Design a protein around this motif. Structure first.
Motif, PDB file in Angstrom:
ATOM      1  N   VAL A   1       0.814  -1.208   0.000  1.00 57.37           N
ATOM      2  CA  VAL A   1       0.000   0.000   0.000  1.00 57.37           C
ATOM      3  C   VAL A   1       0.860   1.275   0.000  1.00 57.37           C
ATOM      4  O   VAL A   1       0.345   2.388  -0.146  1.00 57.37           O
ATOM      5  CB  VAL A   1      -0.945  -0.004   1.231  1.00 57.37           C
TER       6      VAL A   1
ATOM      7  N   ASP B   1       2.760   2.456  -2.209  1.00 57.75           N
ATOM      8  CA  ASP B   1       2.707   3.188  -3.477  1.00 57.75           C
ATOM      9  C   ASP B   1       1.643   4.271  -3.421  1.00 57.75           C
ATOM     10  O   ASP B   1       1.769   5.306  -4.078  1.00 57.75           O
ATOM     11  CB  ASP B   1       2.361   2.266  -4.658  1.00 57.75           C
ATOM     12  N   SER B   2       0.593   4.031  -2.643  1.00 58.08           N
ATOM     13  CA  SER B   2      -0.510   4.982  -2.539  1.00 58.08           C
ATOM     14  C   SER B   2      -0.271   6.118  -1.550  1.00 58.08           C
ATOM     15  O   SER B   2      -1.059   7.063  -1.482  1.00 58.08           O
ATOM     16  CB  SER B   2      -1.804   4.246  -2.178  1.00 58.08           C
TER      17      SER B   2
ATOM     18  N   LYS C   1       3.029   7.648  -1.203  1.00 61.04           N
ATOM     19  CA  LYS C   1       4.417   7.983  -1.463  1.00 61.04           C
ATOM     20  C   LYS C   1       4.957   9.259  -0.828  1.00 61.04           C
ATOM     21  O   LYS C   1       6.089   9.281  -0.349  1.00 61.04           O
ATOM     22  CB  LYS C   1       4.657   8.050  -2.972  1.00 61.04           C
TER      23      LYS C   1
ATOM     24  N   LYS D   1       0.001  12.190   2.513  1.00 60.03           N
ATOM     25  CA  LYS D   1      -0.918  11.225   1.923  1.00 60.03           C
ATOM     26  C   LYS D   1      -1.264  10.117   2.908  1.00 60.03           C
ATOM     27  O   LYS D   1      -0.422   9.681   3.692  1.00 60.03           O
ATOM     28  CB  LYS D   1      -0.319  10.609   0.654  1.00 60.03           C
TER      29      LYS D   1
ATOM     30  N   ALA E   1      -4.129   6.485   3.387  1.00 60.54           N
ATOM     31  CA  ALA E   1      -4.997   5.539   2.697  1.00 60.54           C
ATOM     32  C   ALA E   1      -5.698   4.644   3.704  1.00 60.54           C
ATOM     33  O   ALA E   1      -5.152   4.336   4.765  1.00 60.54           O
ATOM     34  CB  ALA E   1      -4.191   4.686   1.735  1.00 60.54           C
TER      35      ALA E   1
END
Ligand SMILES: NS(=O)(=O)NCc1csc2ccccc12
Ligand SMILES: [Zn+2]
Length: 258
Positions: A160, A162-163, A165, A169, A171
């Protein structure tokens, strides 16, 4: 110009904004295995993560945090050197740019590739904010990571990243079971310390497991693809986000085993 791990805002600079950086019970420390003493008064350590409820993962510009719902008595740590119940609030890692470094605590000066921190707050204080105003407000379970075979229970986290980076951010990250990040043995060293990142508060009882978990080179390589910077900014790889060993001063490290 806020704190970080670079040459101009790294660990050797933190004391200016956070004087306690040169305090009497700072973390991490080197664990001299021959000087650590077995302590018979320590009760068995109890890690109960069966009902743990993760909520989301976040890149805060320093590391990435897997946060849990701590509104109820679910994932708790107790026993060992602890008096009472400590509730899991989140976990994160510290890692290096190369496999030869990355951990914060060291064992006889040996540095591991990374270190996992499972953060818990003493429930007698009502919440995390109140706990960090207490000498025994927190308990951090530290686990060393060495590079070798892959850790199955860690892949969901790796996939996860990559989401998230860049800094800021986050998720959704539900149903992650932290039991999959623990080694076989719960043998540990314990000592009174602090948070290893600003504000460096001295409210922590550290419990560092002797047995490291193995993770694959591919898994840690993905940790190193993260960014310290925010989206749209020049890329500064998130590596070497660890603080070096601090003075032990007037402290004794106790071992749970002989
Ligand atoms: N590396 S650490 O766990 O010793 N400190 C990291 C940390 C955990 S909760 C929290 C809350 C505010 C600031 C830092 C932190
Ligand atoms: Zn940490």
């Amino acid at each position: 110009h806020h704190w970080g791990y670079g040459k101009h805002n790294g660990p050797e600079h933190w004391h200016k904004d956070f004087p306690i950086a040169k305090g009497e019970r700072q973390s991490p420390v080197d664990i001299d295995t021959h000087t650590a003493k077995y302590d018979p008064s320590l009760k068995p350590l109890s890690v109960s993560y069966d009902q743990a409820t993760s909520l989301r993962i976040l890149n805060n510009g320093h590391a990435f945090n897997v946060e849990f719902d701590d509104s109820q008595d679910k994932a708790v740590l107790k026993g060992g050197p602890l008096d009472g119940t400590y509730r899991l609030i989140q976990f994160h890692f510290h890692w290096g740019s190369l496999d030869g470094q990355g951990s914060e605590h060291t064992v006889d000066k040996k540095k591991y590739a990374a270190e996992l921190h499972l953060v818990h707050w003493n429930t007698k204080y009502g919440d995390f904010g109140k706990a960090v105003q207490q000498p025994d407000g927190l308990a951090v379970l530290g686990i060393f990571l060495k590079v070798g075979s892959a850790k199955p229970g860690l892949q969901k986290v790796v996939d996860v990243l990559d989401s998230i980076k860049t800094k800021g951010k986050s998720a959704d990250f539900t149903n992650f079971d932290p039991r999959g990040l623990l080694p076989e043995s719960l043998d540990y060293w314990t000592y009174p310390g602090s948070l290893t990142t600003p504000p460096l508060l001295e409210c922590v009882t550290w419990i560092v497991l002797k047995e490291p978990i193995s993770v694959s080179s591919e898994q840690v390589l993905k940790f190193r693809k993260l960014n310290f910077n925010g989206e749209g900014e020049p890329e500064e790889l998130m590596v070497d986000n660890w603080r070096p060993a601090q003075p032990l001063k007037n402290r004794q490290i106790k071992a749970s085993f002989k």
